[PDB]
Amino acid sequence: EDPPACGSIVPRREWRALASECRERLTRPVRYVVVSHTAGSHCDTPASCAQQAQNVQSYHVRNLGWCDVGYNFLIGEDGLVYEGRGWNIKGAHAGPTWNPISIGISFMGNYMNRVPPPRALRAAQNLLACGVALGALRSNYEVKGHRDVQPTLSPGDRLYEIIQTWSHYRA
Amino acid sequence: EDPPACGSIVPRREWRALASECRERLTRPVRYVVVSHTAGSHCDTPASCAQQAQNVQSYHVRNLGWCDVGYNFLIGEDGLVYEGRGWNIKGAHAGPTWNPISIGISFMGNYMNRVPPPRALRAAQNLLACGVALGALRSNYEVKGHRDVQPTLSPGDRLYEIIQTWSHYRA
Amino acid sequence: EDPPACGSIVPRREWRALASECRERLTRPVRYVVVSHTAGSHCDTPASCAQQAQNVQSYHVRNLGWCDVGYNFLIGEDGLVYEGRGWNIKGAHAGPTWNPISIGISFMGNYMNRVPPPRALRAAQNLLACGVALGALRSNYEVKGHRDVQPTLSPGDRLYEIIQTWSHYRA
Amino acid sequence: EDPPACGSIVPRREWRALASECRERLTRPVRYVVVSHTAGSHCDTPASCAQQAQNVQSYHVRNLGWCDVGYNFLIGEDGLVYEGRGWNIKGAHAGPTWNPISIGISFMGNYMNRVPPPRALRAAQNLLACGVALGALRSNYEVKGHRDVQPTLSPGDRLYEIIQTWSHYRA
Ligand SMILES: CC(=O)N[C@@H]1[C@@H](O)[C@@H](O)[C@@H](CO)O[C@H]1O
Ligand SMILES: CC(=O)N[C@@H]1[C@@H](O)[C@@H](O)[C@@H](CO)O[C@H]1O
């Protein structure tokens, strides 16, 4: 139960995550939604992405010393959304300028010469639908690429090609 | 006009469904949701489940000569909802007394023993929530076991037992 | 056997009911009858009542979004008994405890400071009489007031006074 | 600042309630609120209203054999809010569809052709305010009239008009 019409999100407890120690709140409602990639390994099964989420999060917690996996939500090619910091705790995905003002959903893998399956693009869009439903996102939310906000190669050539197609994508 | 925010469904193309030849339309809103099991093999990868999807569909088309897979939606252990007949077409699944007034969803497997995984339960609940938001189901909706409406073990002793707890289950 | 001889009931057809969508049934022989009032306006001609019965049903299925008027029968100040959900299908007129084990005859009007005409009192005792003969009520059924099982004023102060008189009444 | 800062609810003990035997739990935050009226006599002294609260409570516990007064909270014309079964316990006030997803506040008296004092109206809105402050009510909660969800005259045409006025009132 993560309040009405919330498009199937795999809870933290389910992907065996460590406890977030993040105390910073996100002044709701969020306007921007920054899309990124982990540039890490990709996975096509629920089984292997729950390990992959673990991988991404321990690297953020044990090694870089943050309080939690830096993204608000991680997306798998297995077609599911893995819950990271969720809708309320502030992200660490795009720099001081955007972290307090936007949500970061990141696709799990490297997308320079690989495209993500439709099942995971479907997942992402359906995450945003529920975003609005709960009111964490403003019906009129804007979708920028990681490129758009920071000197970075991510989300990756082939996915920056597609997110551009998305109705809410602002230039 | 009225979709608050829906859910993520694997459309027929993606699972490579034979063309539907059904024409009987279900009258909107529907009031009854009937939960059942295919009592066949289970699957936890999006790849195998797209296969299992074709299996149920074809045994129902090439052997029972029905116009399409019997269910409206199919539920995978992969955590995904597969599109069968959808929200608009009557689809053979619980007797002529119930087929025209209920939507039939079916977890893919024999849950006589085994419980389906949390993500499959989420996949289905989110699916009904989408139904209400789309206006295809009514807020009122009643979930019913396959066994409650016709003489069979069908939801599965252990799955039936779970759906008894759900918010909307009536006698 | 021995023609039951009690049907002076106006059919769902004759008063123009919307089609019912209810399917849950009662087990005959049924043990309790619960008397309520519609607390709305009363009618005295068979023309004005078919109007009232259509109206009550409208408020049950259009407003509350119910499968059909919740009462099993409806008595009119016209002297006639109106088919509601009938002898077999389970009504929705007194809570989850009594609903499954009782008939819900309700007088159409507000009997707080009125008495229902004798011709109605008589149609009611007649109905119950019929129920015993068809076998739908136990020879020795128990009558009860709506207020006896719910915090309401139904079936009206003065009518409640009259039914406490009836031979099949029980606290 | 922002602590609880709740209103003033006369506790059970002060009005000498009988021991609550109810055990079911509402799961906060609650989305719905239903406004009823006891449809009995009103009161305007904290002393006389404490009298009423026990009446209602005994009719509910020893006549209907219920585990506590049906309502969660009782508004009084003395200007105090009388604790019924509280913010946490499933109340019995509007059928099995709404009792588990809502909180029942009932104005002590009968408001067919009588408006409640401003005192009252302020007590009940303070109660709701307090209720969001505590996480017991969802911020975007909806208020419905009793009759809006059950065939009943309650809360009274007068009070019903007052409450469609309220923001949070829906359908
Ligand atoms: C450790 C590291 O640098 N990770 C970055 C990642 O954050 C993203 O910017 C990606 C874009 O292609 O490049 C990666 O190298
Ligand atoms: C072939 C066969 O036995 N089919 C039954 C089916 O009719 C139903 O009873 C179902 C209930 O779960 O179990 C199946 O095994």
XYZ file of C-alpha atoms and ligand atoms in Angstrom, chain A residues 37-39 59 64 71 110 112 146 151-156, ligand 1:
30
model
C 21.487 6.097 -16.346
C 23.744 4.276 -13.881
C 26.250 3.586 -16.639
C 28.524 1.619 -3.893
C 31.086 7.297 -1.726
C 18.421 8.228 -7.021
C 24.589 1.896 -20.014
C 25.225 4.673 -25.382
C 20.941 14.486 -17.241
C 28.263 18.241 -18.014
C 27.468 14.585 -18.479
C 27.368 11.770 -20.986
C 24.383 10.051 -19.133
C 21.468 8.966 -19.724
C 23.292 7.893 -22.643
C 31.599 6.876 -11.675
C 31.085 7.686 -12.838
O 31.788 8.537 -13.340
N 29.848 7.465 -13.317
C 29.348 8.252 -14.448
C 27.825 8.387 -14.344
O 27.484 9.178 -13.204
C 27.307 9.070 -15.616
O 27.785 10.415 -15.666
C 27.812 8.301 -16.839
C 27.273 8.958 -18.111
O 27.739 8.240 -19.253
O 29.239 8.318 -16.863
C 29.699 7.545 -15.759
O 31.116 7.386 -15.848
